[PDB]
Design a binder for this molecule. Sequence first.
Ligand SMILES: O=P(O)(O)C(O)(Cc1cccc(-c2ccc(-c3ccccc3)cc2)c1)P(=O)(O)O
Ligand SMILES: O=P(O)(O)C(O)(Cc1cccc(-c2ccc(-c3ccccc3)cc2)c1)P(=O)(O)O
Lengths: 218, 214
Amino acid sequence: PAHGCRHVAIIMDGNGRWAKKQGKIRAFGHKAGAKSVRRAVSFAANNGIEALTLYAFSSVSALMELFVWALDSEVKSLHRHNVRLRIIGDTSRFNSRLQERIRKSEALTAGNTGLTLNIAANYGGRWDIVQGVRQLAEKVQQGNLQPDQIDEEMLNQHVCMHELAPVDLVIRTGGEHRISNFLLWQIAYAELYFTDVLWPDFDEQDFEGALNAFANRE
Amino acid sequence: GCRHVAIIMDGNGRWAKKQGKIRAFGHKAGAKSVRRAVSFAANNGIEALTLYAFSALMELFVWALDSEVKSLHRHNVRLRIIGDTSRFNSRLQERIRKSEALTAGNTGLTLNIAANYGGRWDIVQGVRQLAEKVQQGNLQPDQIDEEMLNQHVCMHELAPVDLVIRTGGEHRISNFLLWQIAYAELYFTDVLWPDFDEQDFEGALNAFANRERR
Ligand SMILES: O=P(O)(O)C(O)(Cc1cccc(-c2ccc(-c3ccccc3)cc2)c1)P(=O)(O)O
Ligand SMILES: O=P(O)(O)C(O)(Cc1cccc(-c2ccc(-c3ccccc3)cc2)c1)P(=O)(O)O
């Protein structure tokens, strides 16, 4: 599309600060944050973005259960919106019901032709590089791979989201200017966009602002 | 307290053109800004300063080493070059090795110059080392973890990078440090490298300080 942006990653932060400023509890901030997630996803779909990767930053094993569990009611709506869903992160420690649910959801939306929405859950950028590395170590132990044949491009095939367009833009709301171990390998050439807007208030116009920044930046 | 600053020095050529001068002029001013930045870091107890030049130079590299290494040593600065130097000519490689050997025991600022460096390359050199230990048999694929990999990436022996500064206007890491900046504060300034001075540097350090608090 015109903005030249195919894949956007967002570090969502500030829901709690937002609530507290309103004199409200964290639950209120979560309702507002989900509403902002729904709006950012439709915005992305309606604007020709191919992939949207979302990371919720928290101001632990159970939390990442709730989080991904909530996303369950959302699956049907997402499917109906022709969105392809994927969960990225270490879910190897999640009970196998979730892992099946997760794979059902991924199976279900797998053939949709709209926005590919990647949701981070128990994700870490270093972990991501590590699992890809383990995968190369296996091929070594099997005598199929020679250490010296290992290059960037090869490791690149084993990190999360290798099959999607490379990340063009990473937006971080909430005021902090750090990656906080979200994508690392994948952001080597991405435009980085930091805004003080808290996630609950980040809307279509804020998203347009980031895309135009990227459009003119490149 | 900011212990290790990494800087993506960008803007020399664009700067030259603004003055109506040739590229070589920007370089000259570029190198003076490096001198000033390194003095500033040493002058303020920063443990490590890592410099990445973002874009013959092999002979000039020999010259920067032969000419400045003596002063850095006198300033108790420990010098290290990071990146792929395996293909530079052997004389430059030797010069790099001696300069490093000469200042290795210094205890002041450790100045890391990234030459022919890339963040992905850096992670891959570490991976290859770990693959060797697997091929041999003294490492099980699933024994590999974050800590282990971290022990084979450049600068693992130094304080973790706290602040990455990119001058020149672009808002990208451009395949500079990747594994190492997972928790680093990122500071972008439109100031062109030749104009980046003590005040600009402190501004970034202040940003780090103030933000570290809030
Ligand atoms: O932004 P924070 O750090 O204040 C916090 O809300 C965590 C958080 C960050 C970003 C996004 C979200 C969030 C993302 C998604 C949803 C959501 C989405 C769909 C359905 C239900 C709930 C709710 C909340 C939560 P926390 O739980 O740490 O107060
Ligand atoms: O413990 P509860 O039942 O009070 C509540 O937190 C449940 C909840 C609803 C929506 C989202 C979340 C939630 C969102 C995000 C995260 C999270 C995100 C990133 C890292 C760690 C934790 C954890 C939990 C939790 P609620 O939103 O109803 O206050």
